Symmetry: D2
Subunit: 308 residues, 4 copies
């Protein structure tokens, strides 16, 4: 069976195990630095299997050795943000956590695809590839699938149609400078601009950019985890089942969109090989101005990162 | 529980019950004019429930009375075509079958949404609305969902990506004059033209138009049923769960696209009310020439129909 | 669409919405006293719908008015225990909370089936039937499914088989005096005794009874929720779909097993009418001794209740 | 991805691909002697993937070379019976067909688990083990699951409960002497006798044994396929996923139940190694009398076999 290790048994990590367990994709190992929490959640999720009717070996541990030879490593060990806080504000703390987790996990699963979740996403994914020394295409960050999910939900709501017939690409760093792409958004093949007037669409775009903060302000004591976990799980599945999914993820660029040496949200084809191909959309001038704005923001965090 | 009556327990009818049963959408009644066939298939499908683990009341009958008060009526009682035959070639035979089924079923389920499948699709759907006297929006034909499914499969194959991230609109009568719309086809929001060169895409378009014949030539003794049944079931589900799905179906037009008094494949929003809204895409000159060609073909069958 | 209100959007209530959403059973309303909490969780979960592909309306609220006309009401507003506590220890705080939630919701959804979860389960379920005045059959408590789930899990683990083939009846109050029934537990119709040695089976019976506490001692700051939520969800589904599932639930006894006027974990046929039948099993003396000892523990919580 | 080859693309084989596709277990190869048949059905089913949303490679072929390196081989090439025939009546024609299919496929997929379906089931499964020379554990016949499925269905129907709660062991040869075991059949762990009266239960035991013929007499031009396919699929899944399901399958006995050198319907733990364990149940005299009578009917088909 496939082996999936989730490093950090917090809200996102545990919910990822939940979405995953239901798909019967393989053994799931929940690791955490706090004793009892992963073991407890693992056992509890395990005990639900007879009810839901899924066969899954879910275990919790505080020992990295238990993650050895994993096919996929999900990193959700970073500290979350509190209201009135920015994802980059977490960089110093999460950089240490991320470095700690990667340096211990990577060596034990050299053939694993690492899916980073810790914020700030782009900078942490970059730090992961950097610490693991893994092939760039096997070190990616979850962000775009979530961002686009929010965006697609808002448009489905606004248009009054099933979220099943809604697709939308979105690029950039996982932050305020985020860049949803209305031109690359459709409903059963039809441009969304045909369904939503410019003013409403622009609001939707703004809501998408602040989507994470919106939830943080409501919860007060934590950040989102249902959508984020669902996104992470869709990526794990893409990899384990080599589905060749076309989705936005934080991938290492070497010139695409005119950007180099940076993890940035771009559309890719996800499969057993991890990032199998980085798509290069024909973005117009407006879109590119937005994209470049985001690029500059991410670059900023990298400069912060490199000085830590 | 919701009640779904499938008139005609042949290949498409039975496979529809199969796709449906697995979704637990309600009671399923399989009706046929031949004794034993529906009862046999009903019982056999019923006996699979303990294995698949779905609760469904599937019954077979030769008595229309058993279809009374159905929420949805699926009509798959028409005679299929043999190789080297055209769907319109079935018009005379299937017109009588269709008239017979509708006149007996409709009265028993006045509040039902009728989903026609019998070929020639557009002309038979028109005959159904005509015989049932039902509100035009509650009498629709399955065709576009199938045609587009074929089209989406070919592009997924060609592009090497999951069929999950592929959407494509397609219009016109369910025939050779069919009109897939590459401009209204995307992969995770991205135009397919970005993935498939014009020559290959044009082949895909041609294959889509002949997709049904392709399968007929292979099977020799019958026509497709897996995809067709899956399409019909997706529509039944859209209705029963009021999903507001954006999909192409044969709907009654009153001026849309410049067409009037005709059942034609157009994108609609499908829900509890049946055809809840007919979308009007901004089709360019080329697309419209194609659309008008298809319109003329359908009109021809209607003229044939009306003279029967 | 059906409507399900979940009073108390904490771990169990939110997780319950999660399992439920994936099932597309109908609209879900998450209510809580803390503002923002239910709104954020409902939005977060709603934003996962495009990723997972389900059409579900999940809303968060602080106003009982939003729960009006619900078909089912899940109550998960109770405070959870910490290590060292018994479920009975929560009776003072939760009797108040429970009375508050039921007095407000019940009047608004007169035809609903109320499913209690708050601990102590059997007492709280009695209280809810009392405060609501609803027919006893439409007021039930979730406990048996969860308890039997832990039991079935330990069995599958021990026998090295799939949980999908393990069935097991479990009776009594949701507490330490809980009565797992080895003689009424089978693997694909084969008595469990044929797979597990008595001594081992005994340890399993014991682990089952102490299952909740095992998790509490691991989590340390909360109690189980994945299995509990799954259990609650299955019950919600049984009612909404009128599945007529045979399962153990805290129901109102009027003489069965020689017990009167108490809510007790017994096997029932759960459907659209709530408890549609209470099964009276031919328990033997050893089993009846365990059952009576449990009914005694329950009656004791009820006397504490009436004392509040 | 895993690979599954289905030899014989008729009703059972095609339907088996259908159930399988929906499960996304891996690539499926439909093979047949008639050209076009497997190609059309595989394409048709493949074109349903966008509608249903599964990523499955389904190919049709007439060349055994395409079945190379399969993980599992389903054999459904046998001729089906017509009203008036017994399954044994097909032994001459199907022994030939079966030998032909196994001699060609087995050599190409040496590590595969072969699952026979062709009737007479027990004899054909023995033949396949013989012609293939594969370890007996990796050659099994599908029969028990289907037989017990019909039984569980009749029970649920009679008891007015959900098939999801009915378990039932069934042993012996896949013929009239089939042995459903009431004493080894439970509803949520509760003996079936507690729900159905002996006289009624007897009629059910009898209906089960004659289940196949009931359908044959209804269809008239073929035999059951939905349940058979579902049964076969569950077995394929058990192997591919290494679920360790406890179920009745025609396995090779070397003394169990005092039977040697025959393929017989017995309970086993089915996993990645095929039959990983044969369970020896404490049947009583009445049950052993039925079992022996069945083993006699089976030995008789084997003597007919060796006579071909
Ligand atoms: N990229 C996205 O789209 C996205 C979405 C949501 C959350 N996030 C981010 O993901 C992270 C996790 O969010 P959360 O809400 O689940 O947080 P959380 O606080 O609930 O969980 C983090 C878990 O990590 C564990 N942990 C800490 N150090 C560890 C170490 N060295 N090894 C192993 N485990 C360790 C903690 O003990 C804790 O259980 C945050 O940084 C958050 O900002 C990103
Ligand atoms: N619109 C599409 O996209 C689409 C796709 C596939 C097939 N079709 C069409 O659907 C029809 C059914 O195809 P099939 O392959 O399932 O055929 P089939 O021959 O397998 O089944 C038709 C069934 O109708 C029954 N029948 C005949 N007259 C009846 C009456 N008066 N009442 C009740 N039942 C009656 C038959 O006995 C038979 O079992 C054909 O007309 C075919 O061309 C349309
Ligand atoms: N098998 C069972 O029956 C079972 C299983 C698990 C938990 N439980 C019990 O269920 C309850 C919930 O457990 P939890 O872990 O989810 O707790 P929790 O603390 O996470 O959540 C309870 C939620 O109720 C809310 N709340 C409080 N008063 C309220 C009121 N008047 N109206 C609406 N909401 C209100 C809180 O603000 C909180 O969000 C506990 O009492 C626990 O012991 C029972
Ligand atoms: N419970 C069971 O074990 C069970 C259940 C149902 C059916 N069956 C048996 O399974 C067989 C299939 O039933 P069916 O209804 O699908 O029949 P069918 O006639 O529909 O299909 C059999 C297919 O095998 C093909 N075939 C013939 N010779 C072949 C060869 N040498 N190689 C490859 N393909 C070949 C045919 O052309 C045909 O498409 C029958 O023998 C039937 O009695 C067993
Ligand atoms: O905002 C957060 O911290 C987490 C959700 C997200 O990254 O979108
Ligand atoms: O071609 C046929 O007759 C049936 C399949 C379709 O209508 O596409
Ligand atoms: O142990 C607890 O408090 C909650 C879980 C349960 O009721 O089993
Ligand atoms: O009755 C038949 O021939 C096939 C179905 C079965 O084997 O039960
Ligand atoms: Na477009």
């Amino acid at each position: 069976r496939k082996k999936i290790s989730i490093i950090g048994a917090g809200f996102v990590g545990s919910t990822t195990a939940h979405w995953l367990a239901a798909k019967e994709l393989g053994d799931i190992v929940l690791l955490d630095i706090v004793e009892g929490v992963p073991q407890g959640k693992a056992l509890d999720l395990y005990e639900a299997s007879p009810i839901e009717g899924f066969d899954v070996r879910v275990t919790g541990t505080n020992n990295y050795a238990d993650t050895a030879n994993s096919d996929v490593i999900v990193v959700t060990s970073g500290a979350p943000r509190k209201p009135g806080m920015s994802r980059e504000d977490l960089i110093k703390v999460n950089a240490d956590i991320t470095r700690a987790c990667i340096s211990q996990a990577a060596p034990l699963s050299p053939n694993a695809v690492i899916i980073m979740v810790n914020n700030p996403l782009d900078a942490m994914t970059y730090l992961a590839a950097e610490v693991s020394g893994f092939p760039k295409e096997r070190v990616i960050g979850q962000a775009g699938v979530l961002d686009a999910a929010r965006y697609r939900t808002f448009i489905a709501m606004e248009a009054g149609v099933s979220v099943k017939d809604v697709q939308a690409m979105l690029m950039g760093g996982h932050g305020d400078e985020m860049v949803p792409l209305p031109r690359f958004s459709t409903i059963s093949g039809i441009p969304v601009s045909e369904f939503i007037a410019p003013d409403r669409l622009a609001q939707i775009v703004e809501r998408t950019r602040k989507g994470g903060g919106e939830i943080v302000n409501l919860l007060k004591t934590g950040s989102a985890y249902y959508a984020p976990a669902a996104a992470t799980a869709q990526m794990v599945e893409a990899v384990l089942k080599d589905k060749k999914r076309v989705m936005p993820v934080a991938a290492y660029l070497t010139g695409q969109y005119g950007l180099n040496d940076i993890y940035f949200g771009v559309p890719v084809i996800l499969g057993a090989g991890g990032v199998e191909k980085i798509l290069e959309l024909p973005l117009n001038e407006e879109e590119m101005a937005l994209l470049n704005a985001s690029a500059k923001a991410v670059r900023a965090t990298l400069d912060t990162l490199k000085s830590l």
